[PDB]
Symmetry: T
Subunit: 135 residues, 12 copies
Amino acid sequence: LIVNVINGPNLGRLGRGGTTHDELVALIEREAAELGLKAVVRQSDSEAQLLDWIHQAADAAEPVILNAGGLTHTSVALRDACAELSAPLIEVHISNVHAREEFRRHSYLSPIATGVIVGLGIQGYLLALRYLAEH
Amino acid sequence: LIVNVINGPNLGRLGRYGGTTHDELVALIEREAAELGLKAVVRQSDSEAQLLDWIHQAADAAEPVILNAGGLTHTSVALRDACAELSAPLIEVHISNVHAREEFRRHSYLSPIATGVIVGLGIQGYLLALRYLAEH
Amino acid sequence: LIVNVINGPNLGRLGRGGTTHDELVALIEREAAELGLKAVVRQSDSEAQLLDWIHQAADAAEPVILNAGGLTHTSVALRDACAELSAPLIEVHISNVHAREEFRRHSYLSPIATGVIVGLGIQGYLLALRYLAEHV
Amino acid sequence: LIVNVINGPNLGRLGRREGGTTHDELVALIEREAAELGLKAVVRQSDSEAQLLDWIHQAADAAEPVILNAGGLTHTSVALRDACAELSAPLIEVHISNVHAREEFRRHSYLSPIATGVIVGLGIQGYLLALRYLAEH
Amino acid sequence: LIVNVINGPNLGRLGRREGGTTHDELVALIEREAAELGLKAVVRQSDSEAQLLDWIHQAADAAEPVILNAGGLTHTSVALRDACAELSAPLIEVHISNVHAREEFRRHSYLSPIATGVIVGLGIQGYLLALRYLAEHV
Amino acid sequence: LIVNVINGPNLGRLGRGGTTHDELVALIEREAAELGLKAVVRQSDSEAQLLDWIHQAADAAEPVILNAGGLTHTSVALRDACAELSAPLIEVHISNVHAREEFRRHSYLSPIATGVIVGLGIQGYLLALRYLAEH
Amino acid sequence: ELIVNVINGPNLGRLGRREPAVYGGTTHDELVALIEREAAELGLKAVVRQSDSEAQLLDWIHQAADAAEPVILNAGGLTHTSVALRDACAELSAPLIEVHISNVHAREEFRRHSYLSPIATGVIVGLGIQGYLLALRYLAEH
Amino acid sequence: LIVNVINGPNLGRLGRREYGGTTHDELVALIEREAAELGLKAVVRQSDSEAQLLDWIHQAADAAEPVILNAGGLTHTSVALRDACAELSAPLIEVHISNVHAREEFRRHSYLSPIATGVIVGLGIQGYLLALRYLAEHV
Amino acid sequence: LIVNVINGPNLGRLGRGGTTHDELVALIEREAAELGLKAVVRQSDSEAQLLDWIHQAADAAEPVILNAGGLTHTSVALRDACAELSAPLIEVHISNVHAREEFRRHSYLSPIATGVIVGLGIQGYLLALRYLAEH
Amino acid sequence: LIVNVINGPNLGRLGRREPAVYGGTTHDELVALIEREAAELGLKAVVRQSDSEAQLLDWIHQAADAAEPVILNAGGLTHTSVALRDACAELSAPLIEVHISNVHAREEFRRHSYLSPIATGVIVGLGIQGYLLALRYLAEHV
Amino acid sequence: LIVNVINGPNLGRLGRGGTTHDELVALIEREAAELGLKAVVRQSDSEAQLLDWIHQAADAAEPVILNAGGLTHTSVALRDACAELSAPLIEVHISNVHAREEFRRHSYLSPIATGVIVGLGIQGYLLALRYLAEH
Amino acid sequence: ELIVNVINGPNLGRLGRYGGTTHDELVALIEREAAELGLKAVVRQSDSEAQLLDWIHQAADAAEPVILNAGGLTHTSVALRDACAELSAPLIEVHISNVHAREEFRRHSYLSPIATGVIVGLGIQGYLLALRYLAEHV
Ligand SMILES: O=C(O)C1=CC(=O)[C@@H](O)[C@H](O)C1
Ligand SMILES: O=C(O)C1=CC(=O)[C@@H](O)[C@H](O)C1
Ligand SMILES: [Cl-]
Ligand SMILES: [Cl-]
Ligand SMILES: [Cl-]
Ligand SMILES: [Cl-]
Ligand SMILES: [Cl-]
Ligand SMILES: [Cl-]
Ligand SMILES: [Cl-]
Ligand SMILES: [Cl-]
Ligand SMILES: [Cl-]
Ligand SMILES: [Cl-]
Ligand SMILES: [Cl-]
Ligand SMILES: [Cl-]
């Protein structure tokens, strides 16, 4: 059981909460070890690169945890790539997106995702991992 | 550590999709809480006033709240205002993916004042919310 | 067959053209009897009470003639409960909601109802009964 | 006492789709019910908007009630609303299917605000229930 | 000089629904006013959209001025607007009642953007003032 | 007898069609004389001055022909003043206000005016005068 | 000799500790004390009641309608949401005054609409708990 | 193999204002010659009457024949026409001569598009012939 | 001590309830005397004049009772001027603005005002005076 | 004549991606079909696909410099990209927009295009044939 | 080479950053002299007065730098007068008008202006002068 | 020296093929103008959103000012707005044409609310005036 953890634009800028992307990678590694699954963490500011990673996960029938960053609210292309996924897709936001600007309260990904976790910080990733471990 | 799980209108009607009843949900939440070293108090009411009362009590006791308000999520400013008193973390839960249904379900009065929102992860949404609170 | 006639908020205030709810209850009961039906007519200003009456009608698989009053335009919770009904559900308004304020022109119940009767006075209940006598 | 039943565009096409009742059979159902109630029913169908307006003009002059199913014209025609505004005798709008359980544009009616009452989603029986109201009022 | 006065749905029913000037009286008064101004008015009424479309085609084909009261079709008919867009001679839109002191859906018109001008709420005299404009126009 | 023709902002700028405001006043007065009416034509860019003129017409119970210019689409204050008028009120626009921007297609004046003339040029005033002579 | 009903909706029993920067530090019991004193000063009798239940509020409005007694209403969250409450208040023959403690227009946009305002005699917003007292003074004058 | 080509309001007035020199009489002939070349037969008709258009569509539904439809202004306004067209089981292709999206916003909504097989817009009168070719390639 | 009562466009036309603006000035001055305050009541149809008065109140740190009339729904200039006020600002409307047309249900002044009194007739002013006497 | 057929994001996934919506024909097969139709029409067709907005912009730029007509299916970018529209506005030779699925029978957000207003023509919902029909249009006025 | 700087409602209130209107007029005239231009800076809280100043600039064919204050978002009349201008028109806002309330993000003046400078403080005026010097 | 980043988004490499000045001519033009003000301008262009995000990140880490013309991404990219939100040094948004005299969708900007200021419609000089603002704000 391999879970794909895909981070979109600006997410490599974490810390620089105060948890850096390197620290998040480490946290996911340990949680994956506890849950008895493999987790691959990827980050790109490139929409095309994210599309390719979804495509691979579609063909490999592997679960995806996706934090699309700003592309969440804007990209039909990313939504359409995600629609190919037969394994579960969990949308993740670190901050509570409904406490911010109104334009952030709409998502192209949410309707086609299995579930969404919002505002639970970095823990949102680990909780999504646990959902997939027990499903 | 005491955690309140509060279920709103129609949630007592669980599995009467899907299969899991409210009693079975209560038992799962209590079992997971015990493993995490927490105590969970699970309540359900179709009455807005009763929900408001439980929120007020949680505000006075500064206890965390896992809230599934059902249909009141999209309609009740009064429930939002009650939840605004809470000093301890508030997590909003929905069993179904609220964004894969009607457009009126894609707005929540509770979300902006909640700490976090878990949607569409089924009944396990409650248990993941419990684990978050045990880790904070 | 048992037919449930459920009236929402402010409907116990009928009269003060001048038919009271007590007169309405009796008129519905007599009309249903002539059609070979039993009419159970109940009114409440409490949403929680209305939800409970819907739950029972869902479990007993009984037809519901519903006039939710103001809750027609506001309650997602009542819609979700009515969504459970397997037997026909008929929405009734005494006045013509389309000839009044614009907010009365939306109903949360209509999309999940079997049918809707509007503006035909108290006889709207009687015509709803006659539909149920035929179907199905 | 005579009551006018007026059907708009596409309503002559009743049967092929879905209930499974034809317009001829609907005419027979309404007439049988009207006589029983002590009323006379004139049931007419046209795809032409100009023909519906003329039938409504005559109904207004004769001060006769109108049971109207305008079809798609319910949502689009201001002229039809203006004609129905002349009616001094009661007007009951009828839809066969539940108009609110379909597309959103069907959920608005130009006729509803000026009608006495509206019956929606009760199938063919909606016409008969409309007649019974008129026998009372 | 011919001026086309075209009345749409429900306007044959003038003298009811709202004061009590019939359409025949409207035809008679427009023709009297047209004669005084040195014009010939062709006044016609129909509840049929196709007929109104045809009359407008004729007025475009003959390059003749149009005074148009479309009734309910004012707020609804794109077809009528497209037909009117073909007109090279002036077009005046007329409403007898004040359309802005009524329902909000009446405050939009498909014809107004493509007309020369619009007269609203001046009663039956709106037609007569539209004729007078066309006596100097162009 | 007495008819007030009130012009709002930028209407003194006519010419630089081609007809200037001085010539318009002359046209209106000549047309009013032929109909057996006296026309008082006044122009101001000041909202306060327009309200004052409308207040006087309300007190004197005299008909008003009003071209409020830009204030047509923006001024509730002007609308409220015109509401006091008992004698008829004719709203006039020189250009076809519906063949331009969408914000010009709303008028605060229209719902409370007896009638509206639009797009009939300078002659809009004259036809408005002719309506009042018959009423 | 003249009765004025003061009706408080959801969450108003929580006055004192609930969002103090928005509603103040005065307790509901102290509010009851302040209103009753001011009413007697004006020659009126004030009956002050609070409920989190919509049904209970509807009932109090009905009774006020039958008795033809004035109502001072702070519906709380139900201001922006309840058509049922609006419909009940429409029965009132005696004046209805809508009261908000906080300035409802200086906050979220959804608070800037009220189902109650169009059918009330008048509305007092953002003048604190004194809004109640000023509403009493209007009724004593009318 | 009969294909119905139905033109709505104002389409009888083709080539009177101007782009656009081909008349409706000549368009009818172009469609028929192209249809014959593709081994099909086109029945091209035009009416300003909605009732007449509805009648032609009813017949097409009962005969189970494909429809190529340019409804003119009724595209954006007629629910009745939509409802009649929904009865069609054979392919329905919406056609517009000009680019409907390069004009007024209200022309960017079609009641017909959702219930049609496909839509051809802005390719001139050749839109008709390309719609014919779609049908010929799916015989 | 010094409370400013400022009335906008058309409010000099009160009476033409039958309470005149002269009577309103008298009532306010009477009520201010009972509460131990001095009330300076002023009316103008000119937006510019009202802005000037707001500026003066801002510089003097004096409370304002404001009925802007039609400018309530239309004037951002007046909103920005009133934003300068450090002393309390009470918005007043004589009629119930929410029982009328929909455009009246929006106020540019409400969000920056201390409070709003609507639909309590002429007494709204006197109740607003009483609030200020308590602060 | 040289015609450019450009496919946007996810269009390289044809055959596998939601087949009940887009069909079972792969992108490689689409390339072969277009080349077969082009040869019959006496044209030369260059078919290219990219998931990258930048690469698509570059192909549009080149087509503008060479004044070659473009058949474009932008995929998801259709409803989102102003940048693509601004590139396409630079084309002097015709631009035909193609959608495989009937975009108006689906979600409402798909019923708007940034590309449609600046395009010459638009073909929607005729499947893979849409591309071939666009080819013939360009051939008949080349 | 004459440039007209026209300041609208509330702009005389600058200071009470901390740059006053007098200081602004001083800074504009310094920059005008260095660029070989003549700057006429004028302020009014009166809409009618602003309309008059742009009428003069229209007649003289002189460029305008306009900061209309709250009238930016509300005045069609001001837009209509500015439409007459043959010479360039630059719209200026001192603050970032897009970082505030939503109603401020719409301008009636922007569409008819040559250019718009926003959020660059007092220097927005001086940078507008420098544009007009090269045009 | 005092470094100023000038970042151009999609389609801006295509300048001069409505206008006349090419992008290369613009780069050289900005550089010389910056030097005269005692600044050093680094002018960069990309049609790739990922590349613009990269350049914005580096500007945030170095705390250097940014003059940004994001092209079509102005109206569409939340990602770019979020990256620009990290900037502590001033940010100036630039549009060559008057974005308010064109289509309605161009009148909304995701970047404007988070920018220090916005210069629109002043042609190629908009870049130069932006540099001059930064010269006074060091
Ligand atoms: O006392 C008040 O002003 C309020 C109380 C409430 O509970 C809120 O729902 C209302 O929007 C404001
Ligand atoms: O080929 C098509 O019609 C489509 C392809 C896509 O990738 C979708 O984003 C688009 O909405 C429809
Ligand atoms: Cl969506
Ligand atoms: Cl919210
Ligand atoms: Cl709904
Ligand atoms: Cl309506
Ligand atoms: Cl239009
Ligand atoms: Cl209005
Ligand atoms: Cl309301
Ligand atoms: Cl549709
Ligand atoms: Cl506001
Ligand atoms: Cl567009
Ligand atoms: Cl604008
Ligand atoms: Cl924004």
